[PDB]
RNA sequence: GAAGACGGUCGAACUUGACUAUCUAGAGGAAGUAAAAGUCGUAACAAGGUUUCCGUAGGUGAACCUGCGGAAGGAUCAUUA
């Protein structure tokens, strides 16, 4: 299987596709994880480090995330199956890079990290601005400026 | 001595701009309370495993942690020329 980047598109002939996103649930109750084995892939695809759309899982399900160079897993603690994650795979686009002028999520981040700024760009028709305050991974990006 | 006309004086109503009082519709956003077999932790109650609480300022998935100055509603009404 592959798929489109976004769902909220119908459209088979839209610009943007990659692989399928897929998971381990791992131990027993009271100690069980979710395990993303594709994520440097997809991270590559998307052309992002691979912390920032793990990290988002944790921020919306309120859960805790883990990273590991020794072992080179991603983890979203808890069991996170099928729909849990697979109703919302869009999130990581839908609510930062679509365009509100156009639904082509082309788009750039650039981070101030000494003056607490995140500048967006988008190429589809030019919008361009900051990522939104209220939103939860502002505080994660800027103390992990991207490479 | 009839119709009619100039001038005053009451003043309904009409046009135009502004102010204002009630009721009422709405993209999208951000909160509160029911219900008690969803999810990730374990902040408080016994020294609750870093005593707790107040004012102020900074910081984070969340509960919350840290700096400065107070309170006991403390776990000491007491410590010896």
Same mark, same amino acid.
């Given at each position: ?12 002939? =839209? ?10 649930? +791992? ?19 998307? $052309?992002?480090?691979?912390? =920032?759309?793990?990290? =988002?899982?944790?921020? #919306? ?9 020794? $072992?080179?897993? =991603? ?5 996170? #199956? ?12 839908? !609510?930062?890079?679509?365009?509100? +002028?156009? #639904? $082509?999520? #082309?788009?750039?981040?650039?981070? $101030?990290?000494? !003056? ?26 800027? !103390?992990?400026?991207?490479?």
């Amino acid at each position: 299987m592959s798929v489109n980047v976004n769902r909220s598109v119908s459209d088979q002939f =839209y610009r943007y596709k990659m692989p399928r996103l897929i998971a381990k649930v +791992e131990g027993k109750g009271n100690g069980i994880k979710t395990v993303i084995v594709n994520m440097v892939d997809v991270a590559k695809a998307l $052309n992002r480090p691979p912390t =920032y759309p793990t990290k =988002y899982f944790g921020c #919306e399900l309120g859960a805790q995330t883990q990273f590991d160079v020794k $072992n080179d897993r =991603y983890i979203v603690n808890g069991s996170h #199956e099928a729909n849990k994650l697979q109703d919302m795979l869009d999130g990581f686009i839908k !609510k930062f890079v679509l365009c509100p +002028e156009c #639904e $082509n999520p #082309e788009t750039d981040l650039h981070v $101030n990290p000494k !003056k607490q700024t995140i500048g967006n760009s988008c190429k589809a028709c030019g919008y361009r601005g900051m990522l939104d305050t209220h939103h939860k991974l502002c505080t994660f990006i800027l !103390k992990n400026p991207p490479e």
